[PDB]
Amino acid sequence: GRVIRNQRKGAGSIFTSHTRLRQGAAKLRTLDYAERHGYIRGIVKQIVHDSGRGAPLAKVVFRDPYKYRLREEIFIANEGVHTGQFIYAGKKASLNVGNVLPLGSVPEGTIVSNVEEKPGDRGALARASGNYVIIIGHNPDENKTRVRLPSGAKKVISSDARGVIGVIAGGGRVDKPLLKAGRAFHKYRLKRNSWPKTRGVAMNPVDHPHGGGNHQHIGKASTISRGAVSGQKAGLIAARRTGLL
Amino acid sequence: RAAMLPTNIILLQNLVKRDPESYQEEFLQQYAHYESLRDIFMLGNGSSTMAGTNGTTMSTSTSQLIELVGFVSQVCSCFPRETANFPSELKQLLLEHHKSLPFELKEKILSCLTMLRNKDVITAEELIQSLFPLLVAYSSHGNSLGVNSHAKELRKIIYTNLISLLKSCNTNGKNQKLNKSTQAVCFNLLDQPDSQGIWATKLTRELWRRGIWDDSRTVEIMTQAALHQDVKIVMSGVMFFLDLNFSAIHLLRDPQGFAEKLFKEHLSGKTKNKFDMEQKISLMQLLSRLIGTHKLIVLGIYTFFLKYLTPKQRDVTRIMSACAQACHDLVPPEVINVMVRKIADEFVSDGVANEVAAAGINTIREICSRAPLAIDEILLQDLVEYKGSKAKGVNMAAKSLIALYRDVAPEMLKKKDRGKNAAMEVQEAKK
RNA sequence: GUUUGACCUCAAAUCAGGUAGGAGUACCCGCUGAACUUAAGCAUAUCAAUAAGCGGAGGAAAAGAAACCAACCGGGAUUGCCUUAGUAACGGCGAGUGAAGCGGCAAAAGCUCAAAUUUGAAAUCUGGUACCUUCGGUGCCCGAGUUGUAAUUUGGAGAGGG
RNA sequence: AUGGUGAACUAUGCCUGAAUAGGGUGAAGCCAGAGGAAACUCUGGUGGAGGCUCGUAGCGGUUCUGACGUGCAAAUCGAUCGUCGAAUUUGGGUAUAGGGGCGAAAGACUAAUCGAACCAUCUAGUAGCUGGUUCCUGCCGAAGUUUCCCUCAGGAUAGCAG
RNA sequence: UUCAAAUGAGAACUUUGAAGACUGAAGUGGGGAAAGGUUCCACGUCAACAGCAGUUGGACGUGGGUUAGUCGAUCCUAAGAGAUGGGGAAGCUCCGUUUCAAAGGCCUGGCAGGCCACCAUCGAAAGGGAAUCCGGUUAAGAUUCCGGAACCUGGAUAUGGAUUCUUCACGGUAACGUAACUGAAUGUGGAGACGUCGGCGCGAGCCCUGGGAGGAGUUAUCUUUUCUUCUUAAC
RNA sequence: GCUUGUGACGGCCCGUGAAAAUCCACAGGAAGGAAUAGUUUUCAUGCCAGGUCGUACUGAUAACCGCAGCAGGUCUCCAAGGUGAACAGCCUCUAGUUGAUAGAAUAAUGUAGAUAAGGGAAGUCGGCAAAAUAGAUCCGUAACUUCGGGAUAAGGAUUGGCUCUAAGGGUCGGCGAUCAACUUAGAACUGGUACGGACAAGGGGAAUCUGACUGUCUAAUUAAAACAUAGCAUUGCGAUGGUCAGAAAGUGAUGUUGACGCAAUGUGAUUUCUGCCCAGUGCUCUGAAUGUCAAAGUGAAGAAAUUCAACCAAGCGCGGGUAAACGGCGGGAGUACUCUCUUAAGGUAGGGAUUAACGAGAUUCCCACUGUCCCUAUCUACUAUCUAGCGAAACCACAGCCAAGGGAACGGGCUUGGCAGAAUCAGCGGGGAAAGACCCUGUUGAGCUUGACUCUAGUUUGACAUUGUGAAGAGACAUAGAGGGUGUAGAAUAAGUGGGAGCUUCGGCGCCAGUGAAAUACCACUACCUUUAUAGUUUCUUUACUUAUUCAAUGAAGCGGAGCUGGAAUUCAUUUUCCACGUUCUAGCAUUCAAGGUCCCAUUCGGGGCUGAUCCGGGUU
RNA sequence: GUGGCCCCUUUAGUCCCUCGGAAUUUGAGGCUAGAGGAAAGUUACCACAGGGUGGCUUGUG
RNA sequence: GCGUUGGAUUGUUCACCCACUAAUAGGGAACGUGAGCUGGUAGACCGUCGUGAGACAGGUUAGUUUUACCCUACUGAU
């Protein structure tokens, strides 16, 4: 048989991301003495757009303490920040939107974004548009902190891990229909080559497990296993269930 | 996914089984719903009547409770608090209503109790008191005659679940405290003379076959069943002692008195005429196979057979094959002579057919293989007449009798039949 | 003495002087490694411990002076030829595969380290430099080296003491 | 099978650049007037939206008992037709290499080669069946179930002749 | 397509002239990129080729011809390619492009004290980019040569000018202005540097057109007539 | 007015539309500089130099690629006048070309066009093809409709030329003077067979099936109801990760990513509909014990090789979930059969179905129109034809008149007959030329599929090694022990079997007495069941440490502990915890070993130290 | 009158042979005598090599 | 000997229908394998079957052979 599309996706010839017009990798400030003990102030200069991304970014300028110079970080903007705003980042920072704090300092019930799975990760969770995590409780002994993620899962992580207050901007982006193939074309033009998607049923047997037949059908049971391997995993990888909910 | 997670239980339980210190509020959010649901369930095509249902569509409340019961039964071990009364709620949901619950919910609770007993949350001593009372209630004849009562299916489910329970309990070592307790309920069911010992016999046979209840205490139960008045209980006992018999005969307390009581109660005593022929024959088989094996003496058997020993009678080849099985070396051969002379008068007489004569001779020679001095030389010769009979049934039959008496009493045979070694043995031993 | 030095380890130089690469590759030393074919079709098998591919040398290479063959009245490094032998043996015991000792011959060749206290004298060696009779010698000066350079000894023997 | 060469055509992605008359319809926003208590409505204008439309260049390639058929041409010529401001057309640079790539998916395209490219070697590969097999004369001279290996079957044999 | 003449042994096909037509500014024109490589131009010149012909030719034989501080490459980086250090791999070689390196360049005053922080290289003759225009000239070369007139970079530098005894300028309320009017480390900002369509405005060139000064053509009748020249570069 | 450049604006985006080199300015103020004279080369002038390579020509119906001087293909700039909406079509100016084998005739058949009386689809599988319509102004425009369209719907009145009228503007003057363009409406007259006079340029309508649409593909026979599409639904994944690569790697794509995301599938706009089954096959479950149960490891026998037994992970088996998973289509009860009754895929209403637009998609009918046809005729151009020059190809056993016969149903050759006169030109397509599919077979070649066979990458679970330092518990081997038995009756809870009528502390008692299949004292046998202890033997679970190992980050910057210091803080006498001297109205600034204080030297135009800024540490975090 | 009318499994060897440097004991191999008895489909997307009238009838069951 | 038609019907025609007509007769030379011109493999969909690749009880749709210039015959011409 042939090698199939998902197997070809791993080499990364024509499936690499399209990264020319991206403003830069969005990240939090590196964990330093200031963020660990007190706070530090920066100025948000520009609220800007990032190609291939629905959420906007913010350019935040901070003052290097060890040398006389300026350092520009690229944050993911939360809903409500504005140019000329002061962003306070650290342990002793106040509880306002856009500020960066550790999860142990804040109380439970608060809303944060761009959370680090571990301290020094510089942003892992709640980065897409309209997304947020909710702190539900702390455990100061054994220092840990329990959070709820956008998928609904509940996790426990270090209280020294950081996050930025508020909701990521750009919400509602998926409530608008596209109505046209051209808008999907231009959307994925800047993300990657995962569009259009031909159906495996419409191919020959060399090209897919689902291919073949005088009628467009699958010969079996679209729930594949998890111990399957590299050419068998067509659809519904490890389905605990199927059907409408 | 977050808003749908409360609706998706299969993902919730896999998440809870990982980190159950989290997902406390997610569990309370469902336990409250389960409580509010059980608090509810606690309490035709004609032109006139309301339309009926197909039997497979259900309510959205029941479809939710059936899911919540499984979720709570699978995470009770993670949340021992807030679930301590859950199995008692299930138990008093079952054995106080029995009827305001749909069959799917009943089945779900019955399986959740079984897995809650597989895990050591619940004990067998309190699961038995849930399972047994439902059998008698769904074998009621008044509960099983609704519109869509699933009484037969429930009676099968509870039965196989009891079997799984006892198989579970008797794996490592035999839980005598449990077996001795649930044999007492079989005894106390067989007392109730209507039909309720069915669920004792049908269960003890299964456990004997699975080898879980090899004990002297159990064979007494089936003895009492065989000595019962109900036909479908007596038959269960008889077919147990049959299954050629099984090792249970070697755990009886008095086989002779057992056979005597059987022959007196069922067949001869009152002549109630309850059993049909197909059951009378199975009783005869048991009696004769006990008798021949254990050297018993009743002497009424051998006149009871004579009514039925006629070729114009229904399925006589089974009766006469049990006639021989009640013969010995140690019984008065006159009461068997009358039997042999009935058979000879009615099966190898004038004009009879080939199959009839062959059946007669074949069932006489296998009598004489146990009771050799039960027919005399004068009729022995009359029957070895039929050696060269041209029919190939009677010849094969007569040769068997000749070879039987060639090794046992060859002087009854004539010189023509003593085959080269019986005659030589007689010639040396006659001088 | 929070100073001044010795050693050890690791580096740097367009430092002084040399060295490797690549080609050819008939033969040679290894590594890696197929299928066509033949077996009935074919997984064992055969083609084959082959072809292709990789690394590495020389005028020859490799091997080589027994941890050998033997069971004899004992032979006596290695290599090659005649023969042993299409044999012993291996194998769907099929297709097929398949050596070795002995004997005759060609050519002939033996040896070296470590392990031993010079301990009454590191006796050893590279380089730099000045002369010379320059494929090298003598002197002198930095250095290597005792965590062992020379002489002496290699199992056939051999050493020390007399 | 082994080892190698190809994205100058063509498939797809990326980078950097370029090209695309004249008309028809007339969306949001806006101006005035009339009717209103006011929600708002009606009329006349403005404006110039659209993976709209007619239709050039351009891109494609529907139909013709079309021309040609050793043709201008190893796919062309004519007329007719689809589309024509965008999922558009295109140059150069770049990436993906063979049981691999790419594919808006026809098993399509991958240098006139694709249900597995091209080059060389293993290789005088091989079944099966076909075709052919080179001077004269003389003498002798046939054969077609007779018996069988898992039925065809390629065979092994009886008999015939030298 | 035609007529005459010339050339020549020979002219339907060459040259000139006289006619008639065609492409009809989305050209049968004038220039370029890729590719080609002297095919360009001249002098001789017909054996073969130009599916007839041939005195002709992109043919044959021999020569000539391509001039740059300003046009380009060169430089920069784009997608991307690719060494080193290190790590794999029997190995031909693979990974990856700042990595887990002691990766080098500045100051002050038997070398002593300080400061800086960072990755080879390649990759566009349509992207970015310092600076030249006119006229004339050749058989064939030109934004390259000739004449004339300018500009950019880099370097050494003298004079004048400006400033200064209130040492590193004044004016203007201000927006800001001027011939200038010191400035190391370090830091910051800007330019380079950017989509597409719609209509509106402004400019250049072209189109159309009038009077006048010249030349040509028609004139059988008419037409103060039809056509044409009257231009102004970089800086 | 055309082309082009430019400016300020507006609209569009789940699209917001390169980087670097290079240049400048600003902040800052190290520093150096005038007085009897300096400073400034960002003002003006003046001086010197600028290397290497390319540079001709074509850029195409003859300079490139197609075997070629091939009607094919191949990127781009400039672009005049008229008609006309127009870079359309037609004619012309500048510039260029006049190249493509010629001459004579005008037969048929052809190729490319054109016209035709009356009838108008009688033709034909089929109105194929052709014809007809066509531009602009005005009137008018149905069903249906996703209310946006359908729609140029349809169907009708007109169009020339000439002479006029009216209206539509700008600049200056305290309504006039002056200047200028083409836009429309209207009237009169006039020629006509024709007036969008050539060119140019929709045929329309009533319905059906189908896919929503725009778009894409089989280069070189299939452009479509196929693919894609937006929309719809499902699944996996919270980074120690999901999906996918790589021989390996201190290796990679998604990923400059983070659930409004990535990956994997199916369906295929909107509207309407969307009922039930987890028996089966798949998928899944942090699913007990028992069963099956590999290697290592353990025990027994033996002189040993070996043999046996026990233990034995995952997986299987077992039982729970799931159908916008493949399947599939009823349920229950009473005695597979047989009787019974519920069937909730019920139309919610008798307004339940009258249902767009788009399409080189498949189909029928009507109007109009015609040489499709009756029924053919005529004309034009290039060929054919003849001539000068040039000059192939296919095919070819030998050849070439017919009939009958034999014959493989079938002769040009043989037999018997009919006949038979040179050499030839133009035509024709009957035969010969003379060069197909379909069917079958190989014990074939390849492609594809599957619980066909043998294998395998990958993945998964177990053992060993890497692998070191501590502790606490549970189970088992193995011995030593200790006790036990309710179906009923019987005084009583009878393993069972065999001997029988006392050893006697008591003569309690055992025998003789019921009842029971079996009879109990007393003493032996050998079955099961349950518990007590650990010489030892082992196995297993949990937990601690860090230096191996592993992961990530950085500028390897602030780590760990301190009567630290100073504050409070609440204590039950002395602590324990918080803080720390550092920063939160504001789109500013923060840099020269850091000023100051303090000790010493030198008096210099300034140097050095402590402190400002707590101490220690063999761990960068 | 010496009867009747038609090839891969396993066991055992007195004092059987061998295990090739000698022996003993286990095992193994022989020769005897006994007892038993590897593998499924599809191809129209395809490719290759080969092969392929007896004068017959008529209108009447 | 001479004539033996024109048309309708493809949810089909191994045929039938109504008209005109003097009449609207039957057949062969092909169909005793296969031979002018015209209707009646590759792509795609629905149905039946198949675990599946695919096949079919089907049905619908779209879908490139191209002489004669040679001999003979025939027709006309020397």
XYZ file of C-alpha atoms (C1' of nucleotides) in Angstrom, chain D residues 8-150:
143
model
C 13.882 22.345 -16.492
C 7.215 18.981 -17.462
C 3.779 18.183 -13.583
C 1.276 17.779 -7.916
C 1.459 20.565 -3.309
C 3.382 24.235 0.454
C 6.551 28.623 1.401
C 9.568 33.409 -0.178
C 9.867 37.523 -3.450
C 7.661 40.145 -7.727
C 4.188 41.030 -11.880
C -0.885 41.131 -14.792
C -6.359 41.588 -15.186
C -10.973 47.161 -21.233
C -16.077 48.744 -21.070
C -21.005 48.015 -19.058
C -25.670 45.958 -15.830
C -27.691 45.349 -10.931
C -27.369 48.841 -6.941
C -26.431 46.181 -0.426
C -24.834 48.999 4.617
C -23.913 54.170 6.034
C -25.904 59.203 4.935
C -29.274 63.829 3.268
C -34.079 65.996 2.602
C -39.490 65.807 2.386
C -44.569 63.572 3.908
C -47.397 60.902 7.808
C -46.782 60.428 12.966
C -47.434 61.550 20.609
C -43.541 58.211 19.666
C -41.963 53.451 18.448
C -41.157 54.029 13.388
C -43.218 53.957 8.299
C -43.572 55.937 2.970
C -41.311 58.764 -1.077
C -37.039 61.024 -3.834
C -31.855 61.148 -3.759
C -26.616 60.099 -2.331
C -23.106 56.060 -1.805
C -20.717 52.150 -4.510
C -20.865 46.291 -1.240
C -20.827 41.472 -3.483
C -15.949 34.162 -3.463
C -23.108 39.013 -8.109
C -23.713 39.566 -13.454
C -22.961 40.589 -19.540
C -18.335 40.510 -21.872
C -12.415 41.725 -23.888
C -6.994 40.360 -22.810
C -5.868 36.251 -19.833
C -6.897 31.023 -17.884
C -9.706 26.681 -19.465
C -11.199 23.141 -23.111
C -18.325 22.160 -23.895
C -20.139 20.917 -28.918
C -19.344 19.755 -34.147
C -21.495 12.515 -38.273
C -16.295 19.545 -38.272
C -10.378 20.055 -40.983
C -6.012 16.832 -40.589
C -5.097 11.451 -40.000
C 3.110 9.311 -42.985
C -0.787 15.684 -40.043
C 2.063 22.173 -39.344
C 1.816 19.079 -34.852
C 3.809 11.641 -31.112
C -2.696 15.789 -29.268
C -2.521 20.549 -33.739
C -6.447 24.076 -36.839
C -11.291 26.475 -37.113
C -15.972 27.933 -35.257
C -18.820 27.420 -30.866
C -18.502 27.339 -25.579
C -17.068 28.016 -19.495
C -14.861 31.803 -16.451
C -12.946 36.701 -16.243
C -11.234 40.887 -9.339
C -11.011 36.083 -7.271
C -10.443 29.158 -3.392
C -7.674 34.156 -9.789
C -3.401 33.656 -13.709
C 1.841 33.686 -13.658
C 7.804 34.299 -13.619
C 12.100 33.354 -10.668
C 14.066 31.324 -5.762
C 13.108 27.283 -2.379
C 11.287 22.429 0.072
C 9.345 17.404 -0.378
C 12.491 11.548 -4.032
C 10.724 5.930 -5.608
C 7.243 1.021 -2.412
C 9.031 7.146 -1.705
C 6.922 12.198 -2.562
C 2.435 15.151 -3.749
C -2.788 14.600 -4.362
C -10.116 20.021 -3.806
C -8.789 12.022 -4.757
C -8.888 10.671 -11.404
C -4.863 5.439 -8.978
C -4.214 11.165 -10.972
C 1.007 13.651 -11.428
C 6.179 12.724 -10.383
C 11.030 15.261 -17.713
C 6.303 12.059 -24.415
C 7.841 6.732 -18.889
C 3.394 5.398 -13.303
C -2.169 0.002 -10.096
C 5.117 1.604 -8.236
C 9.872 6.685 -12.471
C 14.746 6.447 -14.779
C 20.250 4.396 -15.130
C 23.796 0.450 -14.409
C 25.006 -4.357 -12.408
C 23.679 -9.425 -10.302
C 22.279 -11.381 -15.841
C 23.735 -15.067 -21.347
C 17.909 -14.364 -14.892
C 13.669 -18.098 -15.825
C 9.057 -20.976 -16.584
C 5.755 -22.202 -20.325
C 4.951 -22.170 -25.333
C 6.266 -20.535 -30.271
C 9.880 -20.009 -34.321
C 14.347 -21.854 -36.603
C 18.352 -25.619 -36.601
C 23.369 -25.214 -42.769
C 26.506 -31.213 -47.783
C 25.424 -35.882 -51.141
C 24.437 -40.960 -51.759
C 23.336 -46.097 -50.235
C 20.960 -49.837 -46.687
C 17.376 -50.699 -42.696
C 12.982 -48.738 -40.710
C 8.289 -47.432 -36.785
C 4.505 -45.720 -33.427
C -1.338 -43.625 -30.975
C -5.382 -46.267 -23.303
C -0.156 -51.226 -22.131
C 0.336 -50.717 -16.668
C 0.723 -46.733 -12.805
C 2.481 -42.154 -9.066
C -3.811 -37.377 -4.701
